[PDB]
Amino acid sequence: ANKTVVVTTILESPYVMMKKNHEMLEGNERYEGYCVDLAAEIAKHCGFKYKLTIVGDGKYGARDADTKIWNGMVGELVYGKADIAIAPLTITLVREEVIDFSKPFMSLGISIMIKKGTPIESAEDLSKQTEIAYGTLDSGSTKEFFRRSKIAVFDKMWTYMRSAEPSVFVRTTAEGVARVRKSKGKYAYLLESTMNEYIEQRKPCDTMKVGGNLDSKGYGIATPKGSSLGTPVNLAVLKLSEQGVLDKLKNKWWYDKGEC
Amino acid sequence: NKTVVVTTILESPYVMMKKNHEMLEGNERYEGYCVDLAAEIAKHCGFKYKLTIVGDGKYGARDADTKIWNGMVGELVYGKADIAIAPLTITLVREEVIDFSKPFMSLGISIMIKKGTPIESAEDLSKQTEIAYGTLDSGSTKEFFRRSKIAVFDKMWTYMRSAEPSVFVRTTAEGVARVRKSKGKYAYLLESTMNEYIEQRKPCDTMKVGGNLDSKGYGIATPKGSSLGTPVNLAVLKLSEQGVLDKLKNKWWYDKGECGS
Amino acid sequence: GANKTVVVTTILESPYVMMKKNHEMLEGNERYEGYCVDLAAEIAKHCGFKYKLTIVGDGKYGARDADTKIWNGMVGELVYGKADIAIAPLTITLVREEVIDFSKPFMSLGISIMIKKGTPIESAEDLSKQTEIAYGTLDSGSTKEFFRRSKIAVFDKMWTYMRSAEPSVFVRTTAEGVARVRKSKGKYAYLLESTMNEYIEQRKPCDTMKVGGNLDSKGYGIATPKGSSLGTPVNLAVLKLSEQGVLDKLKNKWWYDKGECGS
Amino acid sequence: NKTVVVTTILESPYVMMKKNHEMLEGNERYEGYCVDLAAEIAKHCGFKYKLTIVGDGKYGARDADTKIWNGMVGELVYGKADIAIAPLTITLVREEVIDFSKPFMSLGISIMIKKGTPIESAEDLSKQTEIAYGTLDSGSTKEFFRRSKIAVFDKMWTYMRSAEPSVFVRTTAEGVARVRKSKGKYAYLLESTMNEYIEQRKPCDTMKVGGNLDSKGYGIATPKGSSLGTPVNLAVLKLSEQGVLDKLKNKWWYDKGEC
Structure with a gap:
């Protein structure tokens, strides 16, 4: 037994x-x-x-x-x-x-990470502009979510990301977080809300989560x-x-x- | 078949x-x-x-x-x-x-107010009595409050159980009507899904405020x-x-x- | 929902x-x-x-x-x-x-002074130094509150006069204040917003004038x-x-x- | 933090x-x-x-x-x-x-003169040329005049662009100095806040005149x-x-x- x-x-x-x-x-x-x-x-x-x-x-x-x-x-x-x-x-x-x-x-759910000071408050804000670049993990569910979406705001975001030069995608989560932190206010990263919330509470306290979640899991x-x-x-x-x-x-x- | x-x-x-x-x-x-x-x-x-x-x-x-x-x-x-x-x-x-x-x-559990009411959260409600507040007299929302060991929610429960006249209602319809007819002096605790629906219905006089209190x-x-x-x-x-x-x-x-x- | x-x-x-x-x-x-x-x-x-x-x-x-x-x-x-x-x-x-x-x-x-043409007054200081020509504000609102709370000497002197004057120097509506200037034969001045003072100065019978600079800014x-x-x-x-x-x-x-x- | x-x-x-x-x-x-x-x-x-x-x-x-x-x-x-x-x-x-x-x-935009100059308003400047007038060579005041459809301000702009020698200056300090050294024959257009400040500085030889031309x-x-x-x-x-x-x-x- 046991x-x-x-x-x-x-x-x-x-x-x-x-x-x-x-x-x-x-x-x-x-x-x-x-x-x-x-x-x-x-x-x-x-x-x-x-x-x-x-x-x-x-x-x-x-x-x-x-x-x-x-x-x-x-x-x-x-x-x-x-x-x-x-x-x-x-x-x-x-x-x-x-x-x-x-x-x-x-x-x-999918969410937005910015460097503190960036003038972005929502997915709709990102979709209407190109001066602040934005992207996702280069493989996995978030990229596929955007590729297949029939929602107007999200499909506009996908066609931007697909066509942007140089590439807005990253190989690992860590690479995405580092890219936000080093890009001087000119990159935003799409990732799960749980990781976004966690990084917001770690030093050097230079990132923020903005907007509501884009999906639910x-x-x-x-x-x-x-x-x-x-x-x-x-x-x-x-x-x-x-x-x-x-x-x-x-x-x-x-x-x-x-x-x- | x-x-x-x-x-x-x-x-x-x-x-x-x-x-x-x-x-x-x-x-x-x-x-x-x-x-x-x-x-x-x-x-x-x-x-x-x-x-x-x-x-x-x-x-x-x-x-x-x-x-x-x-x-x-x-x-x-x-x-x-x-x-x-x-x-x-x-x-x-x-x-x-x-x-x-x-x-x-x-x-999740959430707060319904009549437009104009000076309340933004559960903590706001817990600290006062001028604006009365309550739940359905049976079910998952009432029992959440009865068993909570969180300070804010346990204070809200002791208020609700002892308040006069009764702050409880028999149906959802009764709760929504009580908010609408009480001139800002009643707030109703209910499921977030129903709160969101009613906010988009005529006469467009209610609002959802604060974050959810639990998750299901x-x-x-x-x-x-x-x-x-x-x-x-x-x-x-x-x-x-x-x-x-x-x-x-x-x-x-x-x-x-x-x-x- | 639809628009x-x-x-x-x-x-x-x-x-x-x-x-x-x-x-x-x-x-x-x-x-x-x-x-x-x-x-x-x-x-x-x-x-x-x-x-x-x-x-x-x-x-x-x-x-x-x-x-x-x-x-x-x-x-x-x-x-x-x-x-x-x-x-x-x-x-x-x-x-x-x-x-x-x-x-x-x-x-x-900003707060400003309305007189009937001919009245020998050119400024707030002119009003504050005398009592033959009465002066006041709306009985409620931002203009009355400016005078009540001021720590400027000239404005507090004006406030204590207005508070103590009999019969009342306050009026219930803006329209009543303007009418009081026009009917008082040179013996009342009214304190009100510059925007309204300027408008009335360009209306018939053309018997009022705006005098002095504004007292505050909003x-x-x-x-x-x-x-x-x-x-x-x-x-x-x-x-x-x-x-x-x-x-x-x-x-x-x-x-x-x-x-x-x-x- | x-x-x-x-x-x-x-x-x-x-x-x-x-x-x-x-x-x-x-x-x-x-x-x-x-x-x-x-x-x-x-x-x-x-x-x-x-x-x-x-x-x-x-x-x-x-x-x-x-x-x-x-x-x-x-x-x-x-x-x-x-x-x-x-x-x-x-x-x-x-x-x-x-x-x-x-x-x-x-x-708002305002007029600075040397004490004694016979000018009281923008309309006064617009009707004459003996007293020259201008602005900073780049920035918001110049652009205000360039885009205006008000008759008096557009008359002033066409004058300033074609006037000789140039009526524009590189810095605020250059403008104030040109007023003081020109014996009343130059007037400078600048913000009312700065105009008011300079009027209360030695050698006490400048004045602000007229109402503001815009509001900010x-x-x-x-x-x-x-x-x-x-x-x-x-x-x-x-x-x-x-x-x-x-x-x-x-x-x-x-x-x-x-x-």
Whole structure:
């Protein structure tokens, strides 16, 4: 009886981070963050023991069109290397077809990041001008959102981005944030609201989130089909929501530990 | 190929009888956000269906003494309907007895004022008594306040429970009318989705103020073990990613609004 | 939602808004003429909207009752949702700015002295040093408040005189103040806004004069409810009209080109 | 993070370096109308602050070729300062990119003569040529005349463009000096605020005449989305109604006057 549950997750701030003294600590105590606290709450309400592991390839979960192989945390579940994933993993159609998702534990959507002082207050403001350049990650869901949109404001933004020279796209999130900070008020970046809000509270306190969200998505906990963990985990997420614990954890890691 | 029985509830703008309904028949008698949503779900899942209205006019709660479920949840649990498509909130006690799709719409507790009222937030309300404030006498909004350990919300609860005359109301319609007729001296706490809808309706005299106090979602419901559960959930996710859910909300709340823009 | 006709609130006071001589033969917006009628047409053209001119129900500008906390006048119609925009001689003040949005000012003004021609008075200092010629203000509003709160010696001397004088030197309406100058045979002087003083000086029977420099400085602005989508476009339009010379052209038209006196 | 960065410009009597500035430090190095105004704004809004002088010495205009903003406006849009408190005019192109308070001081185009010159108005100048008249060779006053469709002002413009020798000057200082050295045969067109200031300076030989030819105002500027915007706007109106703005103008133009 009593087999230790294998949890897979990903090193991304403020969800999972290495503690300052981590090389002198062992096991689960090496790590801290929003998803570390969430994992402890889920285990307490479901009555299991667990070991935290970091996903081997550093990826979330996508299926290669040519080989048909799943990478990332999703791959670790379908091929039997982990029992549960507790991470900022977005609930999507292709993922839901091969694993089970809990109801969402956190909400998010596409949003605008500016350097403080830039005269932009909304997506409509960006669309009507070209002096302040703007763009997205060079691959992924945000770029595809703009490519396929039939909303007037968003399609105008896409045709601008597609035709702009030099390229307004970036290879990583970190590259996008750095481009805003170094471009002297002349670049704005489109990214998820959760990351935008987090960076706003970190030194040197030179960025701001503006406007409402452009779409709606959620993060969920993932388990393999037929797992004895699926139902208990889903009920625990709903209990934590109604008790106010999820809101308490978001405030802790974004604002109580903020620097601005 | 048996016709699927859908249960729902008559509440604007989700489901409404068309003005000329007496000259029409079947599903064509009805219009609204949930009428459009039902059609999209059926197309993607490949079934035919009949829209029916819940017999007792309720959403779904369990009697503390008899342990019997009422409303749309009851019709699913006891085998009288196949699927519920309505503004039905995803909660722990409901999830224990029926299956829910991932959410099709988000919402949270919010403040309704008559235009001109000097209030911008829950904290503003908590610090005074000249402007009275309250909730429905039953349901998720009232119970949120009863159990909160947040200082501002616990203070609001103790005020509401002891206030005279009663600050509670029996229906949504009663709450909205009380705001409109009280000359700025009543504010109403309700779901953000309904607050947003009413702001775009004649006589255009109400406003939504402040951020949401909590976060939840509406979901499509099926009985446990139903062969509809999995295809319905995948259809909701496809419609979300195609932008159809946002398109339908914008249509019924804002494109059809009566207060300009 | 679909576009609605914009509801404008304003007030019948010459030369800002007046009924045309042939008004019973006209309909809608065309019944009216004046400075604010011309301004409304220019604002609507630059912002691209259709509109209806309506007259404020209670005949007031906008003040809050100290006991009930309720706003009256044009400000009230905006705060409680009965109108979309106010285009009128409405002074930009702190308490009003707290509850509605104001454009940058479209016209400047300040407190000034009106006399009957022949009266031996040339300045505020002249008034302050004597009592044979009585002097006063509106019984409510910004002009009365300027004197009550001033820490300038000459202005406080004027205030204590006015507060203590019997019979009362205050008047209920602007029109009553002007009539009191005209009927008092050289023995009353009236303190009022420079814009009105200048207008009356160009009207028959041409028996009044403006004397001295202005005592303070303020401006009239266009007002919208907080959060209105009209606020920003209206503000940018006022600045364009200013820089193009249109505001100055309209002031000269209604005060001096259409004047009736010595000129 | 708590100390607010203020940008301003060295122009008398708004901001000046004290004679003994090298024996002083920080904000105490500077004096003037906008120095007193900054102190009042900060008191009413509850913030601490540091005075800085704009790096390039300019007010704020956009280069048409590079599309980059210079001056104090540039320091706001590009993230180098939090607020500008200076003699900066409220204009359409500036209002599109930053937030302006309601105006703290009014001004307009006006006529400066040498004491004794027989001129009382723009119409007087327009009807003659013995007394020459002109403006700064670039900037807003020249452009006002170039675009006018008013008969008197367009007659003045056609005269100025064709007059010999040139009636235009490179700086404000050059204009004032030309009035003083021309024995009444040159009159200079400039802002009423500056005209009034110079009339109260030694050797007390100039005068302001006539009504203003146009109307403008100076405003305080903050970046879009700033938490300072609303409190600053409300503070300007409070100071106006308390008589403090008029008190400060009288202090720096007349109590400290030399004539």
